[PDB]
Amino acid sequence: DDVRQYVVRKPLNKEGKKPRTKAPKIQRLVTPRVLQHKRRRIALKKQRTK
RNA sequence: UACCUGGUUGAUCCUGCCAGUAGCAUAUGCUUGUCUCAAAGAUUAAGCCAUGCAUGUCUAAGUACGCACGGCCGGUACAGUG
Numbered sequence: 134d135d136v137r138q139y140v141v142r143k144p145l146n147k148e149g150k151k152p153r154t155k156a157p158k159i160q161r162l163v164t165p166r167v168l169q170h171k172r173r174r175i176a177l178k179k180q181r182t183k
Numbered sequence: 184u185a186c187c188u189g190g191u192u193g194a195u196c197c198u199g200c201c202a203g204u205a206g207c208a209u210a211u212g213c214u215u216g217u218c219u220c221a222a223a224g225a226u227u228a229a230g231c232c233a234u235g236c237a238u239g240u241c242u243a244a245g246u247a248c249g250c251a252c253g254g255c256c257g258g259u260a261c262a263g264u265g
């Protein structure tokens with residue numbers, strides 16, 4: 134299941150401004166950046182060993 | 184600038200101090216037109232304090248769902264300033 138689908142959003146409607154919806158930033162979410170950081174942490178050990 | 188002078192006697196030569204002389208640093212008195220520097224509640228009380236200020240800090244890079252502002256899609260995690 135996808136977490137990004139099930140985020141609880143907040144409606145936000147002030148007088149004189151268009152209606153809006155806001156959702157929080159998901160924390161502890163596996164993203165390609167996290168995997169790439171782990172990949173480089175692994176890849177530095179190979180350089181040290183060589 | 185390696186310097187002296189007056190004072191004890193009726194008069195003289197001495198010892199010997201007092202006073203006289205020139206710097207310096209604290210206060211004080213009188214006086215004071217122009218410019219450059221410049222010390223400044225140490226001395227008696229490390230005695231007592233009204234009031235105000237004198238230590239705070241964010242980058243692309245720890246944590247933003249404060250519309251407090253703000254552009255597009257509009258479930259389509261999180262645009263950006265903060």
Ligand SMILES: [Mg+2]
Nearest residue numbers: 159160161162
């Ligand atoms: Mg995280």
Ligand SMILES: [Mg+2]
Nearest residue numbers: 191192193194
């Ligand atoms: Mg005489």
Ligand SMILES: [Mg+2]
Nearest residue numbers: 201202203204
């Ligand atoms: Mg003298």
Ligand SMILES: [Mg+2]
Nearest residue numbers: 216217218219
């Ligand atoms: Mg003039």
Ligand SMILES: [Mg+2]
Nearest residue numbers: 224225228230
């Ligand atoms: Mg004092």
Ligand SMILES: [Mg+2]
Nearest residue numbers: 225226228229
């Ligand atoms: Mg004192």
Ligand SMILES: [Mg+2]
Nearest residue numbers: 222223224225
């Ligand atoms: Mg002082």
Ligand SMILES: [Mg+2]
Nearest residue numbers: 236237238239
């Ligand atoms: Mg100070």
